[PDB]
Design a protein around this ligand. Structure first.
Ligand code: CLA
Ligand code: CLA
Ligand code: CLA
Ligand code: CLA
Ligand code: CLA
Ligand code: CLA
Ligand code: CLA
Ligand code: CLA
Ligand SMILES: CCCCCCCCCCCCCCCC(=O)OC[C@H](COP(=O)(O)OC[C@@H](O)CO)OC(=O)CCCCCCCCCCCCCCC
Ligand SMILES: CC1=C(C/C=C(\C)CCC[C@H](C)CCC[C@H](C)CCCC(C)C)C(=O)c2ccccc2C1=O
Ligand code: SF4
Lengths: 63, 83, 741, 183, 38, 151
C-alpha cells in the first residue's frame, strides 16, 4: 500500500522539481506544463528517487 | 579573497552537529562520530605520555572527522568568497 | 542537432593502390631511391594526420581501422575458443581442476620439438597455458567442446562482420566530421549502451547460466550430468531447486521486494572455500549494481531533447581565482584532436590494466584461478606490462597533441596554458622529488647491503634492526579487516583476505591469505613511488617542452619526431618529444620490472604454498622476503639466482622452450645495445665499403643501402631492449612458477 | 499507395534494388529485401547462387537415388544418407576423398578462372557453355532464358529441399522415402 | 592485374618464397629426420 | 495529428507512429476474434488445452507460439524492418501498405479508400482497447471465459 503512495509522491515531486530544474521548460501541456521528453526525464528521476527511498525505508524496517 | 575567519566557526559547528547524529552500533558506539571522537581524546589525554596503538579506533575517528571537516571548510571558502 | 550524416561510395574498392606502395604519402608515392624509403613506408603507414590535412578523412580512417582491430581481436578470441575445443584438456580439467594442468597448444612431431607436449593430464600432451582461459570458461558455465566450438565459429562471424563494417564505413558509408564530434551522444551510448547494457546482459548470463552450472560443479556433479544452460531457462523448477527466489519469478523485481533475491544476489565478500574464487552471486550482483550505475550515468549529456549537460558548459563553469580561464577551450581541444583523446584514453586504459592486475590477484574472480599460481603470476604480470605501455603511449600522444594540434588561441590562460607558463616550476620540483625519492628509497638498500657486508646487521633498515613499518598501509589493512558488520554492515567477509582474517585453501594450496607488510614492503613501495615519479618526469618534460625550451625556441617547427637540432648549443641529441617517449619506455620497463619482481617474490615468500593436515603454512620460498628483500644482494641471490634454477635446468624437459627463450631473449636484449650505443654515421660508412664490393661484382642494388635513420636506430634499440628484457622475465617466470607452483 | 518510384515486384511495399532491374532469367521478382546486391558484386552472388543450385540439385537427387538403392561393393551400413555415420564411412573408404580431389581440381583449374572472368565482366555467371544435347538452344535466346530461369527455380527448390531432407532425417532417424510412407 | 602486382611486392614474394622454402626443409626433416651427415 | 495532447508526433515521426498503430490494430483485431474462436472451438490436434489468454499462452509457449514467433519474426526481419525504415527515410509508402489486396475491397477514387483506411485504424483501436479489457476481466474473474463473463 505504501509503495504506490511513495512512488506517486516521488514522481509528483520530480515533476515539480522538473518545472524549476530543467533548462527551458515547455508550458504547452494542459496541466503538468512539461513536454513529453521532459515528462519522461522527470518521471525517470521520480522512479530513481522513489525506488531508492522505498529501499531506504524497507532496509530501516519503516515500511 | 575576503578570508573572514568566521568560516572556521561555521566549519566546526556545521560538521560537528552533522557528525553528532546517532549511528547503528559497531566501532563507533551508536552515540555518533564526534561523541566517540571526543570520548577517544578524553581517555587518551588521561594517559598523556603513552599515545594510542594501531589497534585503537581513535585513528579512524581522527581521519573520518578531519576528512569531513577539511571537506566542509574548503567548500566554506568557495561559498563565502565566490557568492 | 545530434544526427547521422555520411558520404556514400566515397572510396572505390580497387587493388590499384595495393600495387602502389606508399600511395598514402606525397613524399613516398614516388617510390624508393634508397632503403630509407622502405622503413619510412612502415613508420608512416598509420600516421593518418600526416597523410591528409582533413580532420574528416583522418576520423574516417580511424573509425574503419578500429573495425580492423576488432576483426583481429575476434580472430584471436575465436582461435583461443577453437584451441580450447579441439586441442585442449579443458573437459578433463573440469573433472579435476586441482590435479590437471590446463593445456590448449599441441606441437607437431618435427626435429624433436614434441618434447614440449608436456604430461599435463586429461588424456593429452601439450603446452601448459597460463592465460587462465579454463578458469574464465568454467566461470562462464562452459562444460563441453561444442559450446567452445560454437563460440569459436561465432568469433569468426564477428571477425567477418567487423571486416565488412570497417570496409563499409570507409568505402561505402563514411560518417562526416560532425558525426564524430557528437561526444555527448557518444558518452551516453558508451556509458548506458556499451558498459551499462554489457554489464546488465552479462549479469543475465551469470544469473541464468554461470550461477546454476557453477553451483552444481561446486557441489561435485559430473560436468556431463549438469543440465545444459537452456534447461535452467526452460524448466524454472530446475532453477528453483538451486535458487528458491526463482519460485517468485520477476514479481519481486517490479514490486521493490528486492531482498527476495538474497540467494542469487549476495554481499558475502571473501572467496568460495571450494574454488578459491569470488562467489558468483557476489559477481552477478556487482554486475547488476554496475549496470544500473552506467545506464543512469549515460543519461548525463544533452543530445536531442534539451535535458542533460553540455560538456562545454560544464568545463567552462569549472573556473576559480587561482586557475585563470580554467577548463575553457578543452571542449574544442578534445573535439578537434584525436591525439588529445588518445593521450587521456591510453592514460586511463593503461592505469585500468594496472588496477585490474592488483584486483584480480587479491580478489581472484575465477574458480581455481587463485591456486593456479602460473595463471595468477601470468595475469598480474601481463596486465602490468599492457598498462605500462599504454601510460607511455599517453605521453607520446599528449606530446603529439602539443606539437601538431595545440593552438595558443584555444588554450588562452586556461589550465593547459597556465601549466606551460610554469613548466620550469613543475619540472624542477618533480626533478627534486625524483632525487629525494631515489636517494631515500634505493639508498636504504645500498645502506643495508653495506651494513650487512660489514657485519653490521643491527645497523640495517629491517624488521629486526632500524624498522620502517608501513604503519599507514598496516592501519588501512586493519580498517578493511574490521569493515564487515561495521562500516560494511551487510558484508559477511572482507573484500580481500590480502588485508587480513582467514587463510583460504583449495586442496592443500593457499588461494589467498593476509599479506603482512613490514620494512621490506615499505622499502619496495618507495622504489615504486620513485620509478613512477621518474617515468612521469621524462614523459611530462616531453609534453611541457614539446613545442619549445630555452635550448630550442622553435622546437614545434622541427616536429614531434626528429633526432636532434645538431651538435651546436653544446649538443641537442634527443630534445624531441619522441626522444622523451624513447627514454620513458626504459624507465617504464625499469619501474614495472621491479613491480612484477616484488609481486613474484612476495607472493612466493609470504602468500602461495601448502597447508598440512596439522595446519602449518609452508610457503614456496619459506618467508625469505622479509630478511632477503632489504638488500640488492638478497634480490640477486634469493630471487634471480635461486628462482632462475628452474629455467636454466629446463633442457631435456617439457619446459625446455622456456630455457631456449630465456637465452633467446637475453640475446635480443644484448643485440639492442648495438643500436642504442652506436650512431648511423659509423654504419653508413661501413655500408659504403660493402656497397663497393657489390659494385665490383656488378651486384649493387638500385635501391641504395642506407644506415637506419637516427630515430629508427633508437626505435630498433628500445624495441629489442624491451622485447629481450620482457621475454627474459616471461621465460624466467613461467619456467619458475610452472615448476614450483 | 506504394513507394514513389520503381517498387520491387516480389515485395511491392519495398523500393526496387538499384542493380536488379527484372531482366535476369530467374530474377523477375528483383528479390533482395536485405540489400546484399547494394553492397556486394551481383556477378559474384549470381555465380554463388547458380553453383549452390547445381550442387544442391545433384545432392537432393543423390539422397533419393541412394535411398532407393546403393551399390553392393560399397557396403553402406547406414540407410540415412545425410547422417554423420554414412559421411564418415565414405571418407574412410576414400570415395569422398576421390570426388573431393576432382571437385577441388575443378574449383581451382575451372571454377576460380571462371569466377575471375565473370568479375572482369567477360563471362555470364554460371556459363561453362556445356550443352552437348542442345536442350537450351543458342546462348542468349528466349529458350535459353526459360531454361536459365528453370535452372535457378529448380536449384532454389533443391537448396531449400536439402534443408528439409537433412533436418527431418536428424530428428526422425528415418529415410526421406521411409518418412513419407510411414506418417 | 593490380592484385598480381601486389602479390609481386617484396614482402608478399619474400613471405611466399620463405614459406615454400620452410615447407621443403620441414617436409625433408619429417621424411628424413636426424640427418647429421650425407 | 488531430488528438495528440502529449505531442508524441513532435518526437517520433507520424509515418513511424501510424505504422505502429496500424500494426498493433491488425494484431489486436486477429487476437480478439482469435480469443473468441479458441474459447468456442478447439482443434483435434491439441484437445486438452486451457483455452484461457494466460493459460493457453503458457501452454503453447514452447511449441505453437515458438513457431509463430519464428515465422512472425521472419516477416518483420525481411518485410517489416525494410518497410518501416524506408517509410521514415522517405520512400513515399503509406504506413500499413504491404500491397495485400487479393480482392477489390479497398475501393476506388480517394474518399472510399481513406474511409476504408480510417475504418481499419478505428476497428484496430476498438480491438486494441478490447484486448486490454479482456486480460483485466479474465485476471479479476478467477480465469473466466469472455462468453462465460456474461454470468
Ligand atoms: C591491427 C592491425 C592493423 C590494422 C587494423 C591495419 C589497417 C590498415 N592498414 Mg596497416 N599495418 C599494420 C597493421 C594494421 N593495419 C602493420 C603491423 C604494418 C607493418 C608496419 C602495417 C603497414 C601498413 C602499410 C604499409 C599500409 C597499411 C595500410 C592500412 C590501411 C588500409 C588497409 C586496407 O585497405 O586493406 C584491406 C584489408 C583486407 C581486405 C584484409 C587483408 C588481407 C591480407 C592479404 C592478409 C588500414 C587502415 C595501408 C594504407 O593505405 O594506410 C593509409 C598501407 O599502405 N598498413
Ligand atoms: C576487401 C577488399 C578491399 C580493397 C580492394 C580495398 C582498397 C583500398 N582500401 Mg580499403 N578497407 C577494406 C577492404 C578493401 N579495401 C577493409 C576490410 C577495411 C577495414 C579495415 C578497409 C579500410 C580502409 C581504410 C581505413 C583505408 C583503406 C584504403 C584503401 C585503398 C588503399 C589500400 C592499401 O594500400 O592497402 C594495402 C594494405 C595491406 C594489404 C595491409 C592490410 C593490413 C591488415 C588490415 C591487417 C594485417 C593483420 C596483422 C596486423 C598482420 C600481422 C602479421 C605479422 C607478420 C606481423 C584501396 C583503394 C586507404 C585509402 O587511403 O583509400 C583512399 C585507407 O586509408 N581501406
Ligand atoms: C549502444 C550503442 C553503442 C555501443 C554498444 C557502442 C560500442 C562501441 N563503439 Mg560506439 N558509438 C555509438 C554507440 C555505441 N557504440 C554512437 C551513437 C556513436 C556516435 C556518437 C559512436 C561512435 C563511436 C566511434 C567514433 C567509435 C566507437 C567505437 C565503439 C567500440 C569501442 C571499442 C570496444 O569497447 O569494443 C567492444 C566490442 C564489442 C562489445 C563487440 C562488438 C559489438 C558490436 C559492434 C555490436 C554491439 C551492439 C549490438 C546492438 C549488439 C546486439 C546484441 C545482440 C544480443 C542482439 C564499441 C564496439 C570505436 C570502435 O572501435 O569502432 C569500430 C570507435 O572508434 N563508437
Ligand atoms: C643503475 C643504473 C642507473 C642509475 C644509478 C641512474 C641514476 C639516475 N637516473 Mg638514469 N638512466 C639509466 C640508468 C641509471 N640511472 C639508464 C640505463 C637510462 C637510459 C634509459 C637512464 C636515463 C635517465 C633519464 C631520462 C633520467 C634518469 C634519471 C636518473 C636520476 C634519478 C633521480 C635520482 O634518483 O638521483 C639520485 C641518485 C641515485 C638514486 C643513484 C644512487 C644514489 C646513492 C645510493 C645515494 C647517494 C650516494 C652518495 C652521494 C655517494 C657518495 C660517495 C662518494 C663520496 C665517493 C638518477 C641520477 C632522471 C633524473 O635525472 O631525475 C631527476 C631522468 O630524468 N636516467
Ligand atoms: C544459397 C545461396 C544463394 C545466393 C548466393 C543467392 C543470390 C542471389 N539471389 Mg537467390 N535464392 C536462394 C539462394 C541464394 N541466392 C534460395 C534458396 C531461394 C528460394 C527462396 C532464392 C530466391 C531468389 C529470388 C526470387 C531472387 C533471388 C535473387 C538472388 C540475387 C540477388 C539477391 C541477393 O543478393 O541474395 C544474396 C543471398 C545470400 C547472400 C544468401 C542468404 C544469406 C543469409 C544470411 C542466410 C540466412 C538468412 C536467414 C537466417 C534465413 C532464415 C530466416 C527466416 C526466414 C527463417 C543473388 C544472385 C534475385 C535475382 O535477381 O535472381 C537472379 C531474385 O529475384 N533469389
Ligand atoms: C546414376 C547411377 C545409378 C546407379 C549406379 C544405380 C544402381 C542401382 N539402383 Mg538405382 N536409381 C537411380 C540411379 C542409379 N541407380 C535413379 C536416378 C533413380 C530414380 C530415383 C533410381 C531408382 C531405383 C529404384 C526404385 C531401385 C534402384 C535399384 C538400384 C540397384 C539395382 C541392383 C540390381 O538389381 O542389379 C543398383 C545398385 C534397385 C535396388 O534397390 O536394388 C535391390 C531398386 O529397387 N534404383
Ligand atoms: C610449403 C611447402 C610444402 C611442400 C613442398 C610440401 C610437400 C608435401 N606435403 Mg606438406 N604441408 C605444408 C607445406 C608443404 N608441403 C603445410 C604448410 C602444411 C600445413 C597445412 C602441410 C600439411 C601436409 C599434410 C597433412 C600432408 C602433407 C603432405 C606433403 C607431401 C605430399 C606428397 C609432400 C612431400 C602429405 C604426405 O604425403 O604426408 C603423409 C600429407 O598427408 N603436407
Ligand atoms: C648455422 C648453421 C647450422 C647448420 C650448419 C645446421 C645443420 C643442421 N641442422 Mg641445425 N639449427 C640451426 C643452425 C644450423 N643447423 C639453428 C639456428 C637452429 C634453431 C632454429 C637449428 C635447429 C635444428 C633442429 C631442431 C634440427 C636441426 C638439424 C640440422 C641438420 C639438418 C639436415 C637436414 O635438414 O636434412 C637434409 C637437407 C638437405 C640435404 C637440404 C637439401 C636442399 C634441396 C632440397 C636440395 C636440392 C638438390 C640440389 C643439419 C646437420 C636437424 C638434425 O637432424 O640434426 C642432426 C634437426 O632436427 N637444426
Ligand atoms: C591531490 C592534492 C593536490 C593539492 C594541490 C593544491 C590544490 O588542490 O589546489 C588546487 C587549486 C584550485 O584552484 P581554483 O580554485 O582556481 O580551481 C578551479 C578549477 O575549476 C580549475 O582547475 O589550484 C592551484 O592552486 C594549482 C595547484 C598548485 C599546487 C602545487 C603543489 C602540487 C604538488 C602536490 C604534491 C602532493 C601530491 C600528493 C598526491 C597523493
Ligand atoms: C647495426 C646498426 C645499423 C645497421 C643495420 C641496418 C642497416 C639494418 C639491417 C637491415 C636488415 C638486415 C634487413 C635487410 C634485409 C633485406 C630486406 C633483404 C631480405 C632478404 C630475405 C630475408 C627476404 C644502423 O644502420 C644503425 C643506425 C643508427 C643507429 C644504430 C645502428 C646500428 O646499430
Ligand atoms: S650525435 Fe646524432 S643526434 Fe646528436 S647532434 Fe649529432 S647528429 Fe644529432
Amino acid at each position: 500500500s505504501s509503495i504506490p503512495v511513495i512512488m506517486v509522491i516521488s514522481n509528483l515531486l520530480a515533476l515539480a522539481i522538473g518545472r524549476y530544474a530543467i533548462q527551458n521548460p515547455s508550458n504547452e501541456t494542459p496541466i503538468i506544463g512539461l513536454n513529453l521528453a521532459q515528462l519522461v526525464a522527470t518521471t525517470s528521476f521520480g522512479h530513481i528517487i522513489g525506488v531508492a527511498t522505498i529501499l531506504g525505508l524497507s532496509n530501516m524496517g519503516i515500511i | 579573497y575576503p578570508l573572514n575567519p568566521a568560516v572556521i566557526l561555521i566549519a566546526i559547528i556545521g560538521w560537528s552537529a552533522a557528525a553528532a547524529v546517532p549511528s547503528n552500533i559497531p566501532v563507533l558506539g551508536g552515540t555518533g562520530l564526534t561523541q566517540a571522537f571526543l570520548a577517544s581524546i578524553q581517555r587518551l589525554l588521561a594517559q598523556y605520555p603513552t599515545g594510542p596503538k594501531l589497534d585503537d579506533p581513535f585513528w579512524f575517528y581522527l581521519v573520518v572527522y578531519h576528512v569531513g571537516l577539511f571537506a566542509l571548510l574548503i567548500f566554506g571558502q568557495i561559498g563565502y568568497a565566490g557568492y | 542537432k545530434v544526427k547521422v550524416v555520411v558520404d556514400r561510395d566515397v572510396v572505390a574498392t580497387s587493388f590499384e593502390k595495393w600495387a602502389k606502395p606508399g600511395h598514402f604519402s606525397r613524399s613516398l608515392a614516388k617510390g624508393p631511391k634508397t632503403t630509407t624509403w622502405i622503413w619510412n613506408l612502415h613508420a608512416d603507414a598509420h600516421d593518418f594526420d600526416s597523410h591528409t590535412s582533413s580532420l574528416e578523412e583522418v576520423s574516417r580512417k580511424i573509425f574503419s581501422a578500429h573495425f580492423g582491430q576488432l576483426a583481429i581481436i575476434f580472430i584471436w578470441l575465436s582461435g583461443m575458443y577453437f584451441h580450447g575445443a579441439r586441442f585442449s584438456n579443458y573437459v578433463a580439467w573440469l573433472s579435476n581442476p586441482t590435479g590437471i594442468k590446463p593445456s590448449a597448444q599441441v606441437v607437431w612431431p618435427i626435429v624433436g620439438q614434441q618434447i614440449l607436449n608436456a604430461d599435463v593430464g586429461g588424456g593429452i600432451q601439450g603446452i601448459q597455458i597460463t592465460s587462465g582461459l579454463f578458469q574464465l570458461w568454467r566461470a562462464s558455465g562452459i562444460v563441453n567442446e561444442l559450446q567452445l566450438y560454437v563460440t569459436a565459429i561465432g568469433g569468426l562471424v564477428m571477425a567477418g562482420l567487423m571486416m565488412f563494417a570497417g570496409w563499409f564505413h570507409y568505402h561505402k558509408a563514411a560518417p562526416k566530421l560532425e558525426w564524430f564530434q557528437n561526444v555527448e551522444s557518444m558518452l551516453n551510448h558508451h556509458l548506458a549502451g556499451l558498459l551499462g547494457l554489457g554489464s546488465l546482459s552479462w549479469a543475465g548470463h551469470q544469473i541464468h547460466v554461470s550461477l546454476p552450472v557453477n553451483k552444481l560443479l561446486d557441489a561435485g556433479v559430473a560436468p556431463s550430468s549438469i543440465p545444459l544452460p537452456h534447461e535452467f531457462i526452460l524448466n524454472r523448477n530446475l532453477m528453483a531447486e538451486l535458487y528458491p527466489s526463482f519460485q517468485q519469478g520477476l514479481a519481486p523485481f517490479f514490486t521493490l521486494n528486492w531482498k527476495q533475491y538474497s540467494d542469487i544476489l549476495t554481499f558475502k565478500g571473501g572467496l568460495s572455500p571450494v574454488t578459491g574464487g569470488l562467489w558468483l552471486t557476489d559477481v552477478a550482483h556487482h554486475h547488476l549494481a554496475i549496470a544500473v550505475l552506467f545506464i543512469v550515468a549515460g543519461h548525463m549529456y544533452r543530445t536531442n531533447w534539451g535535458i542533460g549537460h553540455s560538456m562545454k558548459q560544464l568545463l567552462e563553469a569549472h573556473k576559480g581565482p587561482l586557475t585563470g580561464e580554467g577548463h575553457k577551450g578543452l571542449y574544442e581541444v578534445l573535439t578537434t584532436s584525436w591525439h588529445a583523446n588518445l593521450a587521456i584514453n591510453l592514460a586511463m586504459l593503461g592505469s585500468l590494466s594496472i588496477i585490474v592486475a592488483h584486483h584480480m590477484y587479491s580478489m581472484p574472480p575465477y574458480p581455481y584461478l587463485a591456486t593456479d599460481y602460473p595463471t595468477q603470476l601470468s595475469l598480474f604480470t601481463h596486465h602490468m606490462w599492457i598498462g605500462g605501455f599504454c601510460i607511455v603511449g599517453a605521453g607520446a600522444h599528449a606530446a603529439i597533441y602539443m606539437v601538431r594540434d595545440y593552438s595558443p588561441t584555444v588554450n588562452y590562460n586556461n589550465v593547459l596554458d597556465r601549466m606551460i607558463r610554469h613548466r620550469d616550476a613543475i619540472i624542477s620540483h618533480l626533478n627534486w622529488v625524483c632525487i629525494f625519492l631515489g636517494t631515500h628509497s634505493f639508498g636504504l638498500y645500498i645502506h643495508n647491503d653495506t651494513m650487512r657486508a660489514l657485519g653490521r646487521a643491527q645497523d640495517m633498515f629491517s624488521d629486526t634492526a632500524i624498522q620502517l613499518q608501513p604503519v599507514l598501509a598496516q592501519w588501512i589493512q586493519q580498517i578493511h579487516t574490521l569493515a564487515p558488520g561495521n562500516t560494511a554492515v551487510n558484508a559477511l567477509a572482507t573484500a580481500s583476505y590480502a588485508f587480513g582474517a582467514d587463510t583460504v585453501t583449495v586442496g592443500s594450496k593457499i588461494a589467498m591469505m593476509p599479506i603482512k607488510l613490514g620494512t621490506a614492503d615499505f622499502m619496495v613501495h618507495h622504489i615504486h613511488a620513485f620509478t613512477i615519479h621518474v617515468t612521469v618526469l621524462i614523459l611530462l618534460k616531453g609534453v611541457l617542452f614539446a613545442r619549445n625550451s630555452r635550448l630550442i625556441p622553435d622546437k614545434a617547427n622541427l616536429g614531434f619526431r626528429f633526432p636532434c637540432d645538431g651538435p651546436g648549443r653544446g649538443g641537442t641529441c634527443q630534445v624531441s618529444a619522441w626522444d622523451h617517449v624513447f627514454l620513458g619506455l626504459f624507465w617504464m620497463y625499469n619501474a614495472l620490472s621491479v613491480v612484477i619482481f616484488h609481486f613474484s617474490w612476495k607472493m612466493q615468500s609470504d602468500v602461495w604454498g601448502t597447508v598440512s593436515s596439522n595446519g602449518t603454512v609452508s610457503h614456496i620460498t619459506g618467508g625469505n622476503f622479509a630478511q632477503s628483500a632489504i638488500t640488492i644482494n638478497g634480490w640477486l641471490r634469493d630471487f634471480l639466482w635461486a628462482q632462475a634454477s628452474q629455467v636454466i635446468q629446463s633442457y631435456g624437459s617439457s619446459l625446455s622452450a622456456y630455457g631456449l627463450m630465456f637465452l633467446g631473449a637475453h640475446f635480443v636484449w644484448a643485440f639492442s645495445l648495438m643500436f642504442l650505443f652506436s650512431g648511423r654515421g659509423y654504419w653508413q660508412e661501413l655500408i659504403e665499403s660493402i656497397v663497393w664490393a657489390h659494385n665490383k661484382l656488378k651486384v649493387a642494388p638500385s635501391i641504395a643501402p642506407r644506415a637506419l635513420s637516427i630515430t629508427q636506430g633508437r626505435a630498433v634499440g628500445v624495441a629489442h631492449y624491451l622485447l629481450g628484457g620482457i621475454a627474459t622475465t616471461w621465460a624466467f617466470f613461467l619456467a619458475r612458477i610452472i615448476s614450483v607452483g | 499507395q506504394a513507394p514513389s518510384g520503381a517498387a520491387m515486384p516480389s515485395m511491392p511495399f519495398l523500393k526496387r534494388p538499384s542493380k536488379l532491374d527484372g531482366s535476369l532469367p530467374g530474377g523477375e521478382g528483383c528479390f533482395d529485401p536485405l540489400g546484399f546486391t547494394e553492397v556486394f558484386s551481383l556477378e559474384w552472388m549470381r555465380e554463388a547462387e547458380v553453383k549452390h543450385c547445381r550442387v544442391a540439385m545433384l545432392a537432393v537427387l543423390g539422397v533419393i537415388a541412394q535411398e532407393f538403392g546403393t551399390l553392393d561393393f560399397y557396403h553402406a551400413q547406414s540407410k540415412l544418407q545425410l547422417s554423420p555415420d554414412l559421411h564418415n564411412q565414405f571418407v574412410q573408404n576414400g570415395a569422398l576423398q576421390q570426388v573431393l580431389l576432382f571437385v577441388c581440381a575443378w574449383e581451382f583449374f575451372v571454377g576460380l578462372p571462371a569466377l575471375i572472368e565473370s568479375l572482369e565482366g567477360r563471362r555470364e555467371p554460371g556459363y561453362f557453355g556445356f550443352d552437348p544435347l542442345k536442350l537450351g538452344g543458342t546462348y542468349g535466346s528466349a529458350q535459353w532464358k526459360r531454361m536459365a530461369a528453370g535452372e535457378l527455380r529448380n536449384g532454389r527448390l533443391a537448396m531449400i529441399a536439402f534443408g528439409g531432407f537433412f533436418h527431418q532425417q536428424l530428428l526422425t532417424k528415418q529415410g526421406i522415402i521411409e518418412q513419407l510412407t510411414h506418417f | 592485374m593490380n592484385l598480381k602486382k601486389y602479390l609481386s611486392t617484396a614482402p608478399v614474394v619474400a613471405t611466399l618464397w620463405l614459406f615454400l622454402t620452410a615447407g621443403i626443409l620441414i617436409e625433408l626433416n619429417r621424411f628424413y629426420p636426424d640427418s647429421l651427415f650425407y | 495529428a488531430e488528438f495528440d495532447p502529449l505531442q508524441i508526433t513532435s518526437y517520433l515521426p507520424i509515418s513511424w507512429m501510424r505504422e505502429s498503430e496500424v500494426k498493433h490494430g491488425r494484431i489486436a483485431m486477429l487476437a480478439f476474434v482469435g480469443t473468441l474462436a479458441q474459447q468456442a472451438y478447439q482443434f483435434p490436434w491439441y484437445k486438452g488445452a486451457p483455452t484461457t489468454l494466460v493459460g493457453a499462452h503458457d501452454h503453447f509457449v514452447t511449441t505453437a507460439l515458438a513457431q509463430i514467433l519464428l515465422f512472425t519474426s521472419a516477416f518483420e526481419i525481411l518485410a517489416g524492418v525494410p518497410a518501416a525504415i524506408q517509410t521514415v527515410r522517405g520512400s513515399g509508402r503509406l504506413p500499413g501498405y504491404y500491397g495485400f489486396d487479393p480482392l477489390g475491397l479497398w475501393g476506388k477514387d480517394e474518399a472510399s479508400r481513406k474511409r476504408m483506411e480510417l475504418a481499419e485504424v478505428k476497428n484496430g483501436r476498438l480491438a486494441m482497447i478490447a484486448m486490454l479489457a479482456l486480460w483485466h476481466q479474465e485476471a479479476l474473474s478467477g480465469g473466466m471465459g469472455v462468453i462465460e463473463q456474461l454470468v
